Amino acid sequence: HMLSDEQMQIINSLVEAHHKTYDDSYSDFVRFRPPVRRLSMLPHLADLVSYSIQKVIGFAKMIPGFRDLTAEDQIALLKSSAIEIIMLRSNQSFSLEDMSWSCGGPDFKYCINDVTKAGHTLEHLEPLVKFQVGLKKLKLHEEEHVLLMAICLLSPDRPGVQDHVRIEALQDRLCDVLQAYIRIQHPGGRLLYAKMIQKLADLRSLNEEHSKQYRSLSFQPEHSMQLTPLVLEVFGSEV
Amino acid sequence: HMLSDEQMQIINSLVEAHHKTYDDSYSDFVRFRPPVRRLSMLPHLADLVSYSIQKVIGFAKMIPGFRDLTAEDQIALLKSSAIEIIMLRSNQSFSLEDMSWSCGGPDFKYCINDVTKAGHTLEHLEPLVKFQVGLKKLKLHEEEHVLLMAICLLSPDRPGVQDHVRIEALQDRLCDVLQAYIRIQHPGGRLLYAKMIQKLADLRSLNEEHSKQYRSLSFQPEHSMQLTPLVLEVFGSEV
């Protein structure tokens, strides 16, 4: 009926974690290869995605008990979740007012069209935008935003995971915190937790559609060369 | 005592080749990750080097009878020569007035210091600058500049070459053209050809010192990740 002590400790860690790995000014986007409006956005977007991965890794390392997993599983989880964790955190810059990620502009205002000039079809971009709007409409306290990413990341059924027992464990502990937080700290959170867990499955689907169109993109050398070593590594098949 | 017909044809091809693969305005340097004055120049310089490789490949493909080699040897030659071909072509932007490559500025004016902020020691940069000044003092007609790169590239003793007989052949044919050109078209070219061939061996040495400090640079993942797929591929060990 009230939040635990080991539960505040966890929430504090996760919010600080996200605070140190997400910039609301986006003041590193200048260091990326410029955006261009072939696949003119690919260089820029690949630089953006590569950058984000490094941040996700920063965040992940600060999720409680994550450093305690085997290096192998840590990799298995990053590799599988990475992309979803990004769609998640990107919502923070998504804008329903104009339906586009605004990290600046007109340079850094990414719309569905841009991601097209990077090798993706509208027939597959549509659901990602839909996912963004629904997520944005949930008006999440940052506590929930953070727990959601930390839970999404610890999702037990990732291809390549070994100790799926302890992973469902640290994710269950997190879910407790979330359900407790909404009930206790969120006025009118009756249906929220459910809606949130609903989002996770929207991600599995979005993740899939990506793996497909990225595979096709990564198999053309003229395109793969536009990527970064990290991207190639994280979305690669090596095991 | 006068230039052949099959010899003008060759010179024409090589000059057009260099004309279509080298830009005197350097108007693509804006598309690179910005330069920064750790290893702040590495991102920019890696983008510059990657760009240059693609150009060298463009040039190489237009060298006469190069398309007639096996895909394997073409690779073996690019991999070994690439770096030297770059030091060669860079001279065109090097400036004795200020001893630095000026492709713009203050942004694109690269000095010895910059290449330091990219993972190389002065105790090894010194000879490259020396090589640039000597080369610049030879005041080469572009015909000679081009033949020099086309000869350097066809250098027969590259690690990994198979048909070293036909390669010494197409390079001998080129050398004829060069010696003929200087004697016939260059007033006071008595000692030139020799000085030029002298430069090639300066390159083998500069090439070596690079392979060493790049190996050390490429073995640190925090650094290799700053590179490009092409660089990694071209300076890699795969066979």
């Binding site: 390392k61 840590q74 990053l78 590799k79 070593p229 994280v234 090596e238 | 925090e222």
Partner: peptide
């Protein structure tokens, strides 16, 4: 395999 990731995970 996974040179960079290992490194990034201190």
């Amino acid at each position: 395999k996974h040179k960079i990731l290992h490194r990034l995970l201190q």
